[PDB]
Amino acid sequence: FLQCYNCPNPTADCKTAVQCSSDFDACLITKAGLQVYNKCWKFEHCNFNDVTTRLRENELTYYCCKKDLCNFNEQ
Secondary structure, rough: OOOOOOOOOOOOOOOEEEEHHHHOOEEEEEEOOEEEEOOOOOOOEEOOHHHHHHHHOOOOOEEEEEEOOOOOOOO
16 A cells, blocks of 8 residues: 545645555645645546646646655645
8 A cells, every 4th residue: 555645625734644545556745826735646647637627726736656655745
């Protein structure tokens, strides 16, 4: 399994460390203005189309990774 910070909704400091389901193979960090997304995620969805449509954010920056808790905001 992978561990990621995973919060259901964007928050300033998502500190909720989870062991993600077998469904997930990546951790996501996304910054769209000052809302921050941290999620258990899927590498197949690590692109602008899938991140933007799934978060409903237009302009954003994102980073996907596969080491435990690599999901931090300073990333």
